[PDB]
Amino acid sequence: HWGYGAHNGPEHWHKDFPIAKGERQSPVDIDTHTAKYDPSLKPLSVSYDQATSLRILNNGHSFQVTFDDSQDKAVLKGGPLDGTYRLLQFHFHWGSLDGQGSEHTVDKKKYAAELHLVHWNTKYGDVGKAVQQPDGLAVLGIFLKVGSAKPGLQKVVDVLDSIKTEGKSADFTNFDPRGLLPESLDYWTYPGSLTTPPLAECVTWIVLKEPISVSSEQVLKFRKLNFNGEGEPEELMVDNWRPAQPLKNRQIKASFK
Ligand SMILES: CCN[C@H]1CN(CCCOC)S(=O)(=O)c2sc(S(N)(=O)=O)cc21
Ligand SMILES: [Zn+2]
Incomplete structure (x- = not known):
């Protein structure tokens, strides 16, 4: 089925999910000089x-x-x-x-x-x-x-x-997602899609301007996960991203000048 390899990766997805070539697909490149500041946009309210x-x-x-x-x-x-x-x-x-x-x-x-x-x-x-x-x-x-x-x-x-490995799960209670947010909530927004199958065009994207920093040791741990199930040949879980898609008839708006 679908994945991120040479034979089942994003360039193949349209054969099973024709909306891959649709008018409001994600992700996109954010051109900071062409994004439009929109003072009608409200601040985000995150209640976590x-x-x-x-x-x-x-x-x-x-x-x-x-x-x-x-x-x-x-x-x-x-x-x-x-x-x-x-x-x-x-x-x-x-x-x-x-x-x-x-x-x-x-x-x-x-x-x-x-x-x-x-x-x-x-x-x-x-x-x-x-x-x-x-x-x-x-x-x-x-x-x-x-x-x-x-x-x-x-x-x-x-x-x-x-x-x-694929299919493993564990109890993960009492985790506070506020610890993952940057200081500023300034953002860009545009109408888009899921970035994985089924690629549905149902998403309002809110992309924060300020990145968070993580350590090399932290990201190295991500790269040690496996795409495969236990007992299959090991394939490291890396590069699980979809490349940028055409903006087409959309405008990216910014909450900040
Ligand atoms: C591996 C599947 N990932 C899908 C799952 N979901 C899709 C099915 C829900 O139908 C009930 S999801 O809405 O939780 C969501 S959000 C994104 S992204 N990358 O944020 O655009 C991918 C997904
Ligand atoms: Zn995602």
Whole structure:
């Protein structure tokens, strides 16, 4: 099935998911000189104080931390959004080398990794319905650069040994996602899609301007995960990013001048 290899990677996805060649695909390159400052955009409101994390799992494409989304406990509002979006999960994309790994780029610059916090619009009642709507999901994207360690990420890094291979999961309670946010919440926003199959065009992207720093030791631990299941030939989980797609008839807006 689909993946990130020579024979099943992003250049092949359109054969099973024709919307890969659609009009609002992600990720995109953010051209900072062509983005438009929009003073009508509100500040983001991130309310994560009551977040309840549940599990961490290797899904064969990335690793994911899942949250209890059965009530409004961890929500995103404001910015370009109408209504309330509940945090469902976060995951990362990363590279084999420090100079690649992010999905979005900024003036063609690639970061070492990209963190996606995935939220769904509560008016649609469940995430399955939300993915069928043009305003169903909001994904907060945060770039990672290599430098100083991020203390709030260490709890994640320390459990990765226990989910090395596809299909492994572990209890992961009491994790506070506020520890992954940068100082500033200034952002770019544009209408886009999931960056993995099914590539649904249901996402309002909110990409933060300020990267977080993580240490080389932290990102090295990501690169030791496996795409394969236990008992299969080892293939390291690296370069699980989709390249930038055509902007087409979209404008990227910025919350800041
Ligand atoms: C390996 C599958 N990853 C998909 C899963 N989901 C898709 C199915 C939900 O249907 C019920 S998801 O909405 O949690 C989401 S968000 C992104 S991204 N990279 O942020 O655009 C990928 C995904
Ligand atoms: Zn993602």
